[PDB]
Write a new protein. Structure first.
Length: 40
């Protein structure tokens, strides 16, 4: 069933390529650590 298993590798490789799309959600992850900018 390699033909069906390989299908999982395609979905992953695609997600990784979507870096520019996963840049916004990643920003918030950092903002939570440093919110000093807001206090000022």
């Amino acid at each position: 069933i390699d033909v069906l298993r390989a299908k999982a590798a395609k979905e992953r490789a695609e997600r990784r390529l979507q870096s520019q799309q996963d840049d916004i959600d990643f920003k918030r992850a950092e903002l939570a650590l440093k919110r000093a900018m807001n206090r000022l």
